[PDB]
């Protein structure tokens, strides 16, 4: 993966990260 390296990603996506 590597989304949870962006903060915004990560924020939105709590699930995913």
């Given at each position: 993966?590597?989304?949870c390296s962006h903060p915004?990603?990560?924020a939105n996506?709590?699930?995913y990260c």
């Open positions: 993966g590597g989304c915004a990603c990560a996506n709590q699930d």
